[PDB]
Amino acid sequence: NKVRTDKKERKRAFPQRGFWKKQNFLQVKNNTVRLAFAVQGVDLLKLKRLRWGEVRKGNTGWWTDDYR
């Protein structure tokens, strides 16, 4: 829990090889958010991928740079 009263720290004292990533569930959630934004005309994924100080209007990118 957030108040750190449980005993969940006991297992973390032992090594484990890896952990499940739940990518199917997380991608479904992310795409739901993306659809909610996109129905209103927002490209959340593009915004998240933009470089610092980079401006791209519409659905444009390196390919637009190449062909323009």
Binding site: R49, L50, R51, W52
Partner: protein, 78 residues
Amino acid sequence: AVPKGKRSKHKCKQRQLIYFFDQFDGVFKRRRESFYRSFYNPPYFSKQTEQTSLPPSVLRPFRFPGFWPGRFAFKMAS
């Protein structure tokens, strides 16, 4: 089974040196050799670090100017 006595500082130092040589000749020399051979190719450019990394480059710097016989920079144009 358990140790019958405490290992001494002298023997622990001996083990330090032996394990250093083992790890050196087993891992570190090889990794350094591979690293120095990789310099003959352009540095790796991870496409997942595009958002923050520099643009791709091929040039590898000459890092000892006191041994460079050529030009260091070109005069400003006009």
